[PDB]
Amino acid sequence: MSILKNDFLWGGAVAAHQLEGGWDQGGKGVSVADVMTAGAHGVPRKITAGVLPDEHYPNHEAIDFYHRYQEDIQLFKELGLNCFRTSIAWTRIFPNGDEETPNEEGLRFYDALFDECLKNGIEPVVTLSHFEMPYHLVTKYGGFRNRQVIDFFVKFAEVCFTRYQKKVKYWMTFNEINNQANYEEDFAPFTNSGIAYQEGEDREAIMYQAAHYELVASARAVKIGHAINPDFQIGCMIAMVPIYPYSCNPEDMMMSVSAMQKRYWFTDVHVRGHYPSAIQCYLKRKNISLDVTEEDLTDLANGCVDYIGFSYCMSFAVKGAEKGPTFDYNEAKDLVRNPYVATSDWGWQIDPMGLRYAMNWFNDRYELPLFIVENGFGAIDELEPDGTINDTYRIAYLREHIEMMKEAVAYDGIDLMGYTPWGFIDLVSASTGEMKKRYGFIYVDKDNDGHGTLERRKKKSFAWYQQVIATNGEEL
């Protein structure tokens, strides 16, 4: 008698560049992740011009899942996962991106990884682009500044769909495609889109042009994937941070509406196949005049997604004072602390009820199945000398989010496909390039400086989630 559906997908989520290591093994090319240095809370990662001899790049070795995946999958099986969300490293398949033929050694690696999952009861869920495009596409072509990179991505997606059509049912095109709505900081444009900005450039206009090309690439991929296997479920991937009005002040309400339009118009294109009128009017008013053709609009219309994959970690709040009639939204400056919720040590506000809010926000608009493909609590873990990791703070975060997700299914009629907590084996964080910001049920002995045995150990949350899955979410 579970609230959640009987065939509910219980898994864990990672990304290739964040855990594989082997960054130059098996023919793999240099990715955008491979030129990003380690950072920390309050210390941005640095993006370097190629791999420089005297820098620490934590994604180069990560946790060495490239060599240890067989042992790790036995831990996944003990945990009881029925699915595993990861990315296919673009640079393992097309090392520089523009080769005529794919890299067969990279195609064999994912053959072996996916086969190892499926023989242990675990279904792979694959994200095609996850912050790891070939660095050669950036330096030579400009990343998604360039229409040519659309075809390079679609070529890559098509190889992947064809090779794994019998092994992978659930796909997603561009991870957290809307992160780049924050274009004032370098991280999201470079990792979403391969944009390295030159001095004096209009950063906003370049982001919107890359977002258009990516949406076109995704839509082309959807149609091609559907032609290869109509049983594929191909979703978008939205970073869903709800943006609350600070108060019932009417300008706070409109500021929140406008911020949500700026952050989530990507979803409308993915789902409906055309641009929403508010973002179109914004672009016209700002004279952001994108290279949009009629074939683009036809591609978008014919490549709508089957479901909405999204991450949830936190919520934001905004005030509308002095935001005038335009309610322009700069994510890097305009956020305010929400006095009603706690916050993590990295400053991510803790708001389990916002997950239910997020699910209703999607469902009110789109009536599509949802897939929670990332959710997690990044926190410092401590080893007791006895050896255990008592991460009750992580059980508390996760259990309250799963309870709110159950309330959304039970009370709001949401169609929820599955739940894959993020970083369920400790890996290198995206925003900061840290091992210290731990998400996992499985501890990995490696620190921010690169020291450690890389041994895996079970935290206390491991047995907690095992029983979550065992009871299909009834025992939290």
What minimum distance in Å lies between the beta carbon of 246 and Na ion? Answer: 7
What minimum distance in Å lies between the beta carbon of 216 and Na ion? Answer: 36
Between 87 and 338, name the residue whose CB sits nearer to Na ion.
338
Contacts of Na ion in 441-460 (CB under 5 A):
none
Closest CA to 141 of 88, 89, 94, 202: 94
Token couple for 375? 């959710």
What minimum distance in Å lies between the beta carbon of 42 and Na ion? Answer: 5
**DSSP line for 329-368:** --TTTSB---TTSEE-TTSPEE-THHHHHHHHHHHHHH--
Could you give the string, one character per residue 58-97, with x where binding to Na ion holds by CB under 5 A and - elsewhere? ----------------------------------------
| Residues 184, 175: Cα–Cα separation, whole Å | 19
Stretch that binds Na ion, among 4-12, 232-240, 346-354, 372-380 (CB under 5 A): 346-354
Beta-strand relationship, 442-444 and 456-458: antiparallel
**Contact with Na ion (CB under 5 A) among 121, 324, 347, 450:** 347
Q: Which ranges constitute the DSSP H helices of 367-459?
A: 392-412
**Count of residues near Na ion by CB under 5 A:** 1
Q: Is 321 in the site for Na ion (CB under 5 A)?
A: no
Straight-line distance from the first to the last Cα atom of the chain, in angstroms, rounded to the nearest whole number? 15
Stretch that binds Na ion, among 226-234, 311-319, 341-349, 457-465 (CB under 5 A): 341-349
Contacts of Na ion in 227-266 (CB under 5 A):
none
What minimum distance in Å lies between the beta carbon of 347 and Na ion? Answer: 4
Contacts of Na ion in 261-280 (CB under 5 A):
none
Amino acid in position 267: T
3-state class of 279 per DSSP?
helix
Place of tokens 């990861």: 86
Taking CB atoms, the residue at the shortest distance from Na ion is: 347
Closest CA to 120 of 54, 76, 88, 85: 76
Place of tokens 């391969």: 194
What minimum distance in Å lies between the beta carbon of 37 and Na ion? Answer: 19
**What residues are labeled active site?**
374
Between 43 and 112, name the residue whose CB sits nearer to Na ion.
43
By the criterion CB under 5 A, which residues form the site for Na ion?
347
